[PDB]
Amino acid sequence: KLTIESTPFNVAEGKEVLLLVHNLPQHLFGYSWYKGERVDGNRQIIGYVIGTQQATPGPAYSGREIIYPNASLLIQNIIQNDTGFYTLHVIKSDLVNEEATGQFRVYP
């Protein structure tokens, strides 16, 4: 089952956080990252397209986020309003969709 894990779970106020994915389906088409617990258009951070090797930012892009080809996310220079949930949307080659959710908190 598609799972998201965070390293580290407890993050400092100036370090970075890495979100990694386990059980990634094969034969994909693209994937995107969201802010929250639902696939909302206004709260999208970054997306990737495999067929053309393309990465495009979204409406919620502060400039501190990096995507990776293995569908992993890096967020650097954490501030106090970046704590909560993130949602991953995966598109398969047969146009069917899947979703997953991850969580972390920020402490001073």
Binding site: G30, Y31, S32, V39, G41, Q44, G47, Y48, V49, Q54, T56, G58, H89, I91, D94, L95
Partner: protein, 263 residues
């Protein structure tokens, strides 16, 4: 289970294939696990649902929910009245709208999309070409009575009556009645025609000669500025203060006192 060929649960209905149900009047379900639920509905192929009156689902995993709707191909959705989805991954959520090609979405009244991954949300608008999809649409036509042809073009909401023929043209809010031509062109004002941007500019060639008169809204070529035919002599003479040659060989308009003082 074994294939079955018989009548359904509706009057004058027909099921032919494996695990098919036809619950409507004069409805037909042919193939593998098809569902025809309304009056005069047809579901042909693999796992097709026809949930509207006189709706047709043909192919593989198609949905036709609107009245007089048509879904043809692979995973197409038609939702409104007289809507058409043809090809692969097309959705039509507008009345009398058409989606044709690969992964297109139309949600406007009388709008058309042809090609790959555009979204048209405006009314009486049209899209021809290619965009991008990665979970959300990155290039949309949100203007009314506007048309765009090419790759990666955007029209914002509130910008109406615009036409784009080119690549990588983004029109902001508050711009109306504009035309853009060429690759990597910019529009920044209303009632304008642009043939370039602030970093690259294009020349216009093979232009005929315009009329040189007072009320003449025609373009001027290089030879006309080089020669100078047809200009207003009096205006050019009283703009650049000029001593006329015929007035110089006879000493006209000469202050006698100052000329006598020097000589």
């Amino acid at each position: 289970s074994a294939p079955v060929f018989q009548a359904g649960t509706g009057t004058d209905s027909t099921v032919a294939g494996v695990n098919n149900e036809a619950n409507g009047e004069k409805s037909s379900a042919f193939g593998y696990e098809n569902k025809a639920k309304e009056k005069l509905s047809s579901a042909f192929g693999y796992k097709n649902i026809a949930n509207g009156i006189e709706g047709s689902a043909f192919g593989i995993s198609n949905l036709a929910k609107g009245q007089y709707s048509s879904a043809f191909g692979f995973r197409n959705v038609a939702n409104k009245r007289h809507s058409s989805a043809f090809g692969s991954g097309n959705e039509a959520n507008g009345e009398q709208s058409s989606a044709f090609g690969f992964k297109n979405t139309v949600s406007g009244f009388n709008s058309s999309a042809f090609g790959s991954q555009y979204e048209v949300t405006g009314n009486f608008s049209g899209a021809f070409g290619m965009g991008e999809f990665n979970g959300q649409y990155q290039y949309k036509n949100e203007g009314n009575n506007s048309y765009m042809i090419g790759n990666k073009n955007k029209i914002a909401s509130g910008s109406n009556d615009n036409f784009i023929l080119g690549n990588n043209v983004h029109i902001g809010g508050g711009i109306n009645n504009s035309v853009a031509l060429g690759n990597n062109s910019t529009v920044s004002a209303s009632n304008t025609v642009s043939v370039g941007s602030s970093t690259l500019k294009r020349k216009i060639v093979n232009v005929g000669d315009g009329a040189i008169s007072a009320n003449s809204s025609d373009a001027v070529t290089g030879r006309q500025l080089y020669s100078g035919n047809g200009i207003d002599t009096a205006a050019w003479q009283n703009k650049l203060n000029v001593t006329r040659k015929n007035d110089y060989k006879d000493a006209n308009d000469i202050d006698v006192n100052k000329w006598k003082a020097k000589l």
